[PDB]
Amino acid sequence: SAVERNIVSRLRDKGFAVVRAPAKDPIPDIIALKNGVIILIEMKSRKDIEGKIYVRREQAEGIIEFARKSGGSLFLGVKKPGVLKFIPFEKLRRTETGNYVADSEIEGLDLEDLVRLVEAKISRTLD
Amino acid sequence: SAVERNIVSRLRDKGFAVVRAPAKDPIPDIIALKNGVIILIEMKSRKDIEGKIYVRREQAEGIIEFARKSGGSLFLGVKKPGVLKFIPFEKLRRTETGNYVADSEIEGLDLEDLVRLVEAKISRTLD
């Protein structure tokens, strides 16, 4: 919420047209658009007792479907102390039940790494 | 509102990832994404002395800016009896006051014509 408004504000300053999903089918929390590049950021997640991050099957599938249909890149936003990290959703492990977990090995991207991937996609589209 | 929910439902049936702008630097009412194609639909408008649909300067400029930033195609949705028409925002006439009006001549697209333009843009991207 304060985290969401902060990401939104920072993506808007970076020239993105940003929309926060309103409150049946799940829509990623943040939709950021810049010159044909669609970035989808999921801020909601669950944690196990140990801190293993996961997204339940139905939530995950809904946002994956939103991503798949939109042609946008989906990320799971992870709250760290004073920083946000973004895991490409394809880096999460799908469990036999269909839940998506962020394994400990997981390399998170910072907002700046995301914007750089966006600027790179923008440059690949012209070329 | 009932019109908005209807467009959303129809675009979702057509394979679009759709988000309604929440309840400000403006966000178009409807954002529909399909395979890299960004469609922005403005439903809110006013009627002038001649019964012509228009968008006020500040609202228009904000949604035009959202479209420029996002790389999406902006449309003004016009409620006709029993039908919805979509005018590409670039077809609207900018008045002396900076308002954007839909001239009588400009016959918009129906939702199906929009989807066809989207499917065509999707096919041009592969080729």
Amino acid of residue A10: R
In sequence order, the 6+-apart residues with CB closer than 8 A to the CB of A31 are A18, A19, A20, A21, A38, A39, A40, A41, A72, B19, B31, B33
Q: What is the 3-state secondary structure (H, E, C) of chain A?
A: CHHHHHHHHHHHHCCCEEEECCCCCCCCCEEEEECCEEEEEECCCEECCCCCEEECHHHHHHHHHHHHHHCCEEEEEEEECCEEEEEEHHHCEECCCCCEEECCCCCCECHHHHHHHHHHHHHHHHC
Based on the structure, what is the number of domains in chain A? Answer: 1
**Method used to obtain the model:** X-ray
CB pairs under 8 A between A and B: 71
Q: A25 to chain B nearest CA, in Å?
A: 10
Q: State residue A35 phi and psi, 5-degree precision.
A: 45, 50
With contacts defined as CB-CB under 8 Å, which chain A residues touch B69?
15-17, 33-35
Nearest CA in chain A to B71: A35
* Partner residue facing A31 (CB), from B19, B35, B69: B19
CB of A33 within 8 Å of any CB in chain B? yes
- Note whether B106 and B82 are within 8 A (CB): no
**Resolution for this experimental structure (Å):** 2.4
For A110, what's the count of Cα atoms within 13 Å in the CB-facing half-sphere? Answer: 6
Domain housing A16 = 1-127
- What's A55's domain CATH number? 3.40.1350.10
Q: How many residues in total does chain A contain? A: 127
- Note whether B84 and B78 are within 8 A (CB): yes
Long-range contacts of A52-58 (CB under 8 A, 24+ apart): A52/A101, A52/A102, A52/A103, A52/A104, A53/A78, A53/A101, A53/A102, A54/A95, A54/A99, A54/A100, A54/A101, A54/A102, A55/A92, A55/A99, A55/A100, A56/A99, A57/A97, A57/A98, A57/A99, A57/A100, A58/A26
CB of A5 within 8 Å of any CB in chain B? no
